[PDB]
Symmetry: C2
């Protein structure tokens, strides 16, 4: 806890996935994933920056079949966060994109995927 006179702080890392790996490493990972699972979408789902009433997700990486709509994914987040009904949340795709719950993620992927090939989503409460 103290090394060489220095007092070390051990707080856990809250990095977004994009800040933990390099662009080359993320691209490399997507290609491996799209090779073994060409019928699934690699989705990164993280907590919005300024969120306060909502807890962090324990698992933020999801391999999703092409055919499921956003509803099917929202309810997954509904189950993983185990939220109460009076606490409403929204899911933004990529950077600030509100998309219809009936849209298949396969169209969302090809329209909104990141430069690295991942599809980034964030959940928030309001504002």
């Amino acid at each position: 806890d103290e090394v060489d006179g220095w007092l070390i702080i051990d707080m856990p890392s809250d990095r977004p996935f994009k800040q933990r790996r390099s662009f080359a490493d993320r691209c490399k990972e997507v290609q491996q994933i799209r090779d073994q699972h060409p019928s699934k979408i690699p989705v990164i789902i993280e907590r919005y920056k300024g969120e306060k009433q909502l807890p962090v997700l324990d698992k933020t990486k999801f391999l999703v079949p092409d055919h499921v709509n956003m509803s099917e994914l929202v309810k997954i987040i509904r189950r993983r966060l185990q939220l109460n009904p009076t606490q409403a949340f929204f899911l933004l795709v990529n950077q600030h994109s509100m998309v219809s719950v009936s849209t298949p993620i396969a169209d969302i992927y090809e329209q909104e995927k990141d430069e690295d090939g991942f599809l980034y989503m964030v959940y928030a409460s309001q504002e």
Copy 2:
């Protein structure tokens, strides 16, 4: 005998009711008379049914205000009560923080014709 002629007002977006040349011309006149104001087109999101249509779609906004000011203005014209939540989307689906200055949104998202297009929708949609 003859024809059944039907006349109904248009609910088509502003971009389809006004030519490109007229829209460009209108912004040019407005930026000349009002160089410190932002011309914003605010319309109801296409598949929206919970919130009504507004009688005014064209808004001349001071360039110094934040997105918050535009939300409060639309909320008032929609006469919403606190239990009614809505979003104001830039372009078609872009969510922006209410603290973002409208001038920054304008220079980043304005249309080629000089207007800034926004739509309002409720969480249901």
